[PDB]
Amino acid sequence: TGNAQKQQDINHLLDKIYEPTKYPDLKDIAENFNPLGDTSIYNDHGAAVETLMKELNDHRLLEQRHWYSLFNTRQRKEALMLFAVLNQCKEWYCFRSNAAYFRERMNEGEFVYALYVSVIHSKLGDGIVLPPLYQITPHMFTNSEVIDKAYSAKMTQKPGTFNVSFKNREQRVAYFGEDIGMNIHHVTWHMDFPFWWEDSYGYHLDRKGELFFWVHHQLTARFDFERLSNWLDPVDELHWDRIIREGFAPLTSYKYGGEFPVRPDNIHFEDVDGVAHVHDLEITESRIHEAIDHGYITDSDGHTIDIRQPKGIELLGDIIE
Amino acid sequence: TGNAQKQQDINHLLDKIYEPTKYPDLKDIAENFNPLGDTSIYNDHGAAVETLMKELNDHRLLEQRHWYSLFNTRQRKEALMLFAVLNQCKEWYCFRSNAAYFRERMNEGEFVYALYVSVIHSKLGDGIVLPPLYQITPHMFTNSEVIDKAYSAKMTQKPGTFNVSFKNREQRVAYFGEDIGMNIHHVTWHMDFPFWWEDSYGYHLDRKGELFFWVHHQLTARFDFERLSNWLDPVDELHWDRIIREGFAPLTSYKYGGEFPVRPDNIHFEDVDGVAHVHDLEITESRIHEAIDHGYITDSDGHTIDIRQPKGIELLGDIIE
Ligand SMILES: [Cu+2]
Numbered sequence: 125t126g127n128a129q130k131q132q133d134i135n136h137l138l139d140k141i142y143e144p145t146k147y148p149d150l151k152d153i154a155e156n157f158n159p160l161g162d163t164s165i166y167n168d169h170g171a172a173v174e175t176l177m178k179e180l181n182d183h184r185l186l187e188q189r190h191w192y193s194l195f196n197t198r199q200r201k202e203a204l205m206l207f208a209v210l211n212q213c214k215e216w217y218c219f220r221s222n223a224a225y226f227r228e229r230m231n232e233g234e235f236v237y238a239l240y241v242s243v244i245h246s247k248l249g250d251g252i253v254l255p256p257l258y259q260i261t262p263h264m265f266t267n268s269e270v271i272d273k274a275y276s277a278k279m280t281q282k283p284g285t286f287n288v289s290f291k292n293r294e295q296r297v298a299y300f301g302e303d304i305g306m307n308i309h310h311v312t313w314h315m316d317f318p319f320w321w322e323d324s325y326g327y328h329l330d331r332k333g334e335l336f337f338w339v340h341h342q343l344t345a346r347f348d349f350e351r352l353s354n355w356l357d358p359v360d361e362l363h364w365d366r367i368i369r370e371g372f373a374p375l376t377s378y379k380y381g382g383e384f385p386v387r388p389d390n391i392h393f394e395d396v397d398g399v400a401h402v403h404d405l406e407i408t409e410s411r412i413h414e415a416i417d418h419g420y421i422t423d424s425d426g427h428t429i430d431i432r433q434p435k436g437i438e439l440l441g442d443i444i445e
Numbered sequence: 446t447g448n449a450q451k452q453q454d455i456n457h458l459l460d461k462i463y464e465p466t467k468y469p470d471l472k473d474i475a476e477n478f479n480p481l482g483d484t485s486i487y488n489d490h491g492a493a494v495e496t497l498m499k500e501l502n503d504h505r506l507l508e509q510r511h512w513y514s515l516f517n518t519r520q521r522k523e524a525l526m527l528f529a530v531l532n533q534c535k536e537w538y539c540f541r542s543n544a545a546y547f548r549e550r551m552n553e554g555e556f557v558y559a560l561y562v563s564v565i566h567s568k569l570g571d572g573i574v575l576p577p578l579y580q581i582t583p584h585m586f587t588n589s590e591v592i593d594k595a596y597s598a599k600m601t602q603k604p605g606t607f608n609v610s611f612k613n614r615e616q617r618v619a620y621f622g623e624d625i626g627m628n629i630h631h632v633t634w635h636m637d638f639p640f641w642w643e644d645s646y647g648y649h650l651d652r653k654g655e656l657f658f659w660v661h662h663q664l665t666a667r668f669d670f671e672r673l674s675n676w677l678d679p680v681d682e683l684h685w686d687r688i689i690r691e692g693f694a695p696l697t698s699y700k701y702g703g704e705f706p707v708r709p710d711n712i713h714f715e716d717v718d719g720v721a722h723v724h725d726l727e728i729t730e731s732r733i734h735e736a737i738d739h740g741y742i743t744d745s746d747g748h749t750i751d752i753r754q755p756k757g758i759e760l761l762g763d764i765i766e
């Protein structure tokens with residue numbers, strides 16, 4: 125152990141993530157290790173490990189040098205299996221090993237995501253401070269311009285820092301939304317208290333519900349404030365039966381993936397194949413809005429669970445998010 | 446009572462259905478029979494009959510030589526009383542009699558529908574085969590042109606058969622829906638397990654409900670295949686909030702009644718007077734959909750009947766059709 129060790133290892137793992145590791149130790153590990161030959165390092169007698177492997181083997185896991193969204197029900201599951209290994213390691217010998225072994229044949233997004241969540245929640249990651257996403261995978265936090273300016277630097281082997289950019293809109297209250305600090309927090313908040321947490325993982329995040337209610341209420345408040353300061357008017361509430369008034373162009377790019385799709389202004393909400401129907405929301409919204417109005421949330425049995433009490437708002441945040 | 450017999454009386458009955466019977470027996474039965482004096486032929490002591498009669502007498506039954514759709518709540522009820530008589534005869538003397546007695550004063554659709562149903566479920570119709578509707582009442586299964594060609598062969602008495610008809614649509618998968626066999630089947634399937642069946646009539650049809658779910662799912666299935674074969678793409682699902690994209694003109698005619706109305710394309714669903722509001726669907730659709738989602742259907746007392754079991758899909762079909 126140590127930390128200036130654990131730490132070191134981490135830094136190495138997340139170094140030039142888009143390419144096979146250059147740190148020799150990480151690679152003989154990456155090669156010689158077998159997550160299945162001492163089912164003892166694992167507190168599960170390695171059921172986790174044996175499940176990743178099985179996938180890695182039938183090679184039914186997402187490819188490397190490809191994008192990844194945490195909203196993709198499969199990409200998530202895969203990402204989250206790495207979490208589950210890293211998670212039941214008794215000591216560092218087992219983490220390093222895996223987050224090396226996998227690091228090299230699992231996709232980067234799943235991987236970056238997996239490592240962070242794992243470091244954050246696993247028993248074994250106390251000493252560590254995680255590098256800032258913004259510098260680990262800069263395509264998600266940097267402009268598309270600066271990105272290309274950086275690819276040029278590199279082509280020519282000439283160094284230096286480029287100035288990023290952001291009178292026509294409400295990309296006047298932009299400084300708020302595009303800040304690398306908020307973006308960090310926004311992701312961290314949901315890494316700290318993930319929507320996918322099962323108390324099987326080890327403990328129980330306390331009031332994730334009210335936490336959820338509140339955190340957004342404040343982005344939402346903080347946001348409303350800035351627009352105040354900009355002669356702008358408080359934000360419109362979004363409806364599924366209306367047009368999406370204010371659309372934008374992000375001018376942002378994926379590393380592997382392409383450029384973030386843009387949305388024109390005054391658009392009509394389309395039924396999106398694979399996710400869900402527009403109407404599917406409308407009804408959800410109704411079911412929600414009826415719990416609130418009745419006084420109770422009704423479970424699967426037709427058991428009405430009361431929410432006209434203090435535990436109220438979290439039970440509500442459990443069903444809303 | 447052979448069946449040869451049984452059978453013969455039945456082809457007699459349904460011969461030249463649009464004009465007074467020409468078979469002399471059926472006639473003088475038609476005239477001298479009294480469905481209510483010897484109410485010992487009825488296993489109901491002629492409750493059945495004494496109701497038809499009453500109607501027949503206050504003259505509030507639907508006229509002859511007029512159309513009839515099985516969807517008309519009255520038209521449906523009258524048709525269905527005939528059913529109730531034929532149904533409580535102890536032997537052929539009683540059917541012959543009524544389907545003769547009634548044949549001659551009761552509307553022809555009521556009458557053709559009443560005799561088949563009766564023939565199909567009454568305990569007294571075993572040996573018979575019913576003639577193919579397509580040849581009993583051919584306006585329903587034949588073109589409007591063919592029909593017309595046929596009125597001319599008859600005005601001039603020179604005989605002859607006509608070829609029916611069916612590059613501009615999806616009346617390219619026509620050969621499927623316009624087939625006299627399908628068509629047969631699709632009506633028979635609903636005569637075998639009728640939507641109006643009360644188990645007071647006699648026995649209980651067994652899984653009408655999954656039977657219902659399943660038969661349509663195979664029309665639909667079968668339907669979807671043919672389109673495949675025609676470079677056409679799978680069928681849109683219909684919504685009450687969008688346009689009826691594809692209308693058609695059936696170029697079909699009724700014998701008494703006129704030409705079947707046509708639907709222009711890209712139409713908007715109108716609230717239709719006497720049947721129900723568009724919205725009315727809209728909420729029934731919701732009501733249904735929530736039963737699917739809750740885990741339970743809820744009766745009129747407010748008792749939730751669970752459908753997350755094998756009797757499941759049938760309970761559902763009983764509230765769906
Ligand atoms: Cu969030």
Ligand SMILES: [Cu+2]
Nearest residue numbers: 631634635661
């Ligand atoms: Cu049908």
